[PDB]
Curated annotation (Swiss-Prot):
Family in the record: Belongs to the transposase IS21/IS408/IS1162 family.
Function statement: Involved in the transposition of the insertion sequence.
UniProt-recorded name of the protein: Putative transposase for insertion sequence element IS5376
Coverage span on the entire protein: 312 to 373 of 400
Length: 62
DNA sequence: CCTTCTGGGGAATTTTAAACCGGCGATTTTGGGGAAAAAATAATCGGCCTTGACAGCTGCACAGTAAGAGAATTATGCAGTGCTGCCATAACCATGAGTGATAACACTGCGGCCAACT
């Protein structure tokens, strides 16, 4: 999905469903799906391209 | 025994309070003109969010009706030929009018001759 020009990668269960992003004025993004809370997206100051996110998820699943 | 004092009541008069109506002074309001600001509306800009497609391609089959393409057949219009009659034209002569021609001068076009350059 996308948020303010940055694209995030969720897991299988979340594909094809509507999540709710909640962003404090502090500057931290929290993803709430179906009332519950899902894993944090380790938001970073430096923007990383979708390709780098795919590579990171690939290495993590490896 | 008598005199004087006092009190009540009706009439006349005076003063002050209240209410209305008018006059006078002030602010408000309406209208027009000029400037400034706000808002509304439309157009243009950037960007985010989300999803469709790209994955060999589409031609054929059936249903009913209508059209059309080709070939055979039929109808009709043109053409061809013969005989007779009528209308047009043409041929000649006369007279009038238009144009082609002829004379003369002036300007221009074409052919013969001379010279200059390569």
């Amino acid at each position: 999905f996308s948020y303010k020009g940055e694209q995030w990668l969720l897991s299988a269960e979340y594909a094809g469903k509507e999540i709710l992003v909640k962003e404090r004025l502090n500057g931290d993004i929290r993803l709430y799906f179906r009332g519950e809370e899902i894993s944090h997206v380790d938001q970073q100051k430096k923007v990383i391209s979708f390709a780098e996110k795919i590579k990171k998820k690939q290495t993590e699943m490896a």
